[PDB]
């Protein structure tokens, strides 16, 4: 193949250009996203029961649905919570690789069979089934700076005018409204109701009858009478459209003939569907949209498209309406693209510089400058071919592939310059000879590097999903690099390089280069002199090699492992938790103080605070809240002290004084769709029918024990909420029957007034919306209000609720949890400093085994994956070792010589471990992939040394020492050229601070450390490997030259 | 409430005896009540923390504190079967005939859940067996409604 | 696929302007378009124009005074004039529908409205003319 | 049955339409509601969309709005069909 | 139409470029492909 294209340099250029064309086309068409799919696919069922308590939600909705969630393919586990806001979410999580559209469809079909069993009020709210493991592309907030709109007004505008256009925009796949369209709110007055002998029952009946849309037939309808001349629709009652029309609904006509209108017993207003959440952006009322990326969409395209769509709506906004963008992953993605291109552009410059320093002509310099971009461009086409996207991981895969691509270019070009100079051969003929020396090894290298990088792609779960991105990127780039090194670079060597006079090593040049050439000739002589002396007493260095191997194992065992570096993503969260029974108003003061702090003591760093009163990440409730802090651009935040990690610690410290609440700030995870990754995720499970109180006791027992091993476990805590006071009201069935009060009128009066009730629909400015009846707030606040509500008996007398009811305080749950269908309590935690989360997990199970009979446990989330993917790393890499060995055995036609390559593996690893240990980094996935590329390069260097040495013995007859010394002399320069260019090319990654620097630091420092020791150590050690392995496995004469 | 009041309430609910004792020593109000009027004694009677009940009473806790609906720690202990706590409360002067806003007595509550031994203790301490809640019902009425024949006997 | 010749335009109510205002805007655009016959030709609505309909108001006060329930009223009007699917029956082994509707001659013209009686709570038969009024208006036979 | 256009649209069409989001590869949606009591909502998907998937996703969104529709509309049966294929043949049946 | 008018020139720029490249490999020349590609209008004028 190289010979064919040396004689057809334009055919070679044509293949290169078609490759570049295919790659450029892929770049204009591939999806771009921050991350590929990494979280296991999850489907969430959401339902709402207005006015329902947690236990009511769970026992009428959650359990009914859960009992039908079987016979679903590839389900890993199921979890749910049912809470005091009337909300249930059931999350089913599927194995990695499950088609999420199939999983959703199967969940939906099982759900739809339980639907007729759910209370009608839950069915009427709509039970949604959504893919919930994807994360937000962006969060749009909406405010009115004129101050003229409540959050309900803003939400209605967003629901009616903005939400669907957004949903219709190119690349959007889901959209969540922060609030609701308007509902018609009827706020009942129990004094006025009683005055007219009425109840919420009669109000609800009158609305259904007088807010109706009646199908009435036609004049002249079919089948018609003969001779009919008129056909026309009959129009009877139509939905009401205004508060005025609702107010004149006729409840009753009194004895004197006077009229009781709905507005005589209720206030009537457009309002929200519910009022649990107060949303504020920098302390002003707000609504908003949470926007998700559609599967396989381009995230950059969608964000731009969303922003254009909102720009085109902006003229038709009511005065003051303002769009804000507190969250958007697009900017961070652009920094990643720009930092990766920057790294590529400057790695090409550095290769130019090193190529010129050593080969001293601009023609040789052009060839790597051409071949590397051809392979990178072409690599995108291979990614397009396999369905992958441009994301953070594939892009860092390519910067990691620079070392291998640069090496292919340097190895080809440096070897032709050496053959030319050592032999005076002309370009065309020196390239033919030089390619003959390296071509077989380049193909064996491609196989060997496949066996290094491909087994990665077979890790399970979330980690395998990440590795798969690196594995496919690096292997595709590597394969393409070899193709280009057998096709384009030989043809470019033969037609662009100019001859070198035999024996000329530039030692007679003037100026700096002549000094360099005389210094580097001297250095090579010292080097081969040194290797010669080392080869005289190989045993001493075999002892030194063992010292290195034991030191690597020692360093490896002590380097903490982790998942992905934290990043300053420009956004963080601050949690607000108030005591039991604390009210919305009390939580709002704390959020106001939190908001004030960020916009005051962090003015330079903070752009906005999006505060949500009514939910947290422990749960929902009036005593819970979250503030999402959006920071100014990283550019305007120079300094260690102005990064998320530092702002977060200052805030938490400042909030330690807040006495009404627990207030904590913290960073986002690197992959917010996956969360934590730090620690374990334990589920305590009621497996007899022990009930909630016994489960809490067992949970408290386990928590107490855990706090008594603080050397092993730390911060082991419940994820959910504690029991809170509730008001238990007993209806006396006997007294109700005696008075002639029906229980349906009783429970409907209590529920509609105190919880509210969805009656039916109305039409507001052309759009269908809900009607809700509820008591006006002042008659539904405290236990004494109970007695102001009257129900009408069969005999027509009004009976106060106090006549047939009693009440008491008790404790119960604001949020019930279930795991795989059984009552459960989730416990978070983490291994103590310097301890393994794998061993912390072992202690947890031993403590758990002491709990009362009927209590059991299970692991979920990141901990579930661990217990199903720890046996993988040694066996997957046993496989890699064996295949590398086999590939090497074919390349060299020997069972023993592969050992002289494989023994270089610890030489790069010890420098990587050293660089990560010194810098206090972890064994994370970026470190791991860098390890394999360092091992890759180091193995490639040894393969060519050993190939040159073995060929010198085989086809030139040289004895062992002369062949080894001569191979090592020939390979010194290209090994140093690649290593100097790559080490320099990766330096910006090691010292990077700012946007994305957590990832760059991680790929940079293990690679730079590994590259240093690999090169310095391998150029002395693989000659030793080759000599001792050749001497140990042999028979007849091979120390001496032969014919 | 105020500072050390809140920590004592949560201490009594969680059953943390040493910490209850420590908060006592630091001058915490034994009779600190939350929003619904529960004292530490309410909390410890509800959750069944016998030792905390003793420690609170030894330190002068109102044995007859009532919540905002009129219920006392004896109601809670009698309702949820904590016999030893019912005896400790009565020994320390708990009003055996206290009525909540519904006219409900510890005897009604103990009877409604069938705690036969508690019912005998309360009777021994002078529980009015004919006491009536707001609906005219006695512990006997409760017994026969529940079909509890043993209880029905004891309550004449 | 259909047509392929020409264009296919959608005029859209994006405030809550309502159907009458949308027709006006549509008529405006159609008039302008007919004033560039060198550019556009045969630009026309795809759908239907508003037609007379019979608007019948039930007086809630008179119904309540007579003791006639609104459900009996709307069900009598709807079932007689529009017809109603009641339940299923079996015809030669196969399940099919039952429909109740007025015979045609009692549901043709506005004067037929008053021949329909609803029974009050006190058992008296009340004609529809006692608690209803009606007028002609215009509305859409087909909303898009 | 017996419904006028506005009744059809405001009790059936809008209720279903408001649930027609979160569907993959949708290009646009159109509907008409008429004096015969009939509504047709047509969702049109990008070329190359698997029509069996598109139908299944539409059906699943529809089935969530079903409990909100008048009982008389539910009893008639709400169909969800692939409507872009054309007639192979039309058979007529007469009695001579 | 409003999503597929920009296609015909760019899709056929692509076709032109690849034809050129294929011709350049066939003839081992960057210039000789032009003596083939220039025949394209000769059939088009008769079709038009
Ligand atoms: C987290 N989430 C999306 C937010 C954020 C801020 C908010 O201000 C709100 C939500 C949830 C939305 C859901 C909507 C829902 N719907 C889309 C109208 C809804 O039916 C309910 C419900 N559970 O009844 C709401 O709470 C809701 O009305 C609501 O009040 C919300 C709300 O106030």
Author numbering:
A (entry chain A): 1 to 1043
B (entry chain B): 11 to 166
C (entry chain A): 674 to 817
D (entry chain A): 50 to 145
E (entry chain A): 866 to 913
Task: Quote the study's own text.
To assess this, we solved the co-structures of V612F and V612W in complex with minocycline via X-ray crystallography. Minocycline is shifted in the binding pocket to avoid steric overlap with the introduced F or W at position 612. Compared to the wildtype co-structure, the contact between R620 and minocycline is lost, but appears to be compensated by additional H-bonding interactions via carbonyl oxygen acceptors of Q125 and G179. Further, the flipped F615 is in interaction distance of the aromatic ring of minocycline. The V612 variant co-structures demonstrate the plasticity of the DBP that is able to accommodate the ligand and allows the formation of alternative interactions despite the alterations in the binding network. In contrast to wildtype AcrB, that crystallises in the LLL and LTO states, the V612F/W crystal structures were exclusively obtained in the TTT state.
Resistance nodulation and cell division (RND) efflux pumps are secondary active antiporters that are ubiquitous across all domains of life. During drug efflux, AcrB undergoes a functional rotation where each of the three protomers sequentially cycles through the conformational states loose (L), tight (T) and open (O). Substrates can enter the PD through several channels and bind to the access pocket (AP) in the L state and the deep binding pocket (DBP) in the T state.
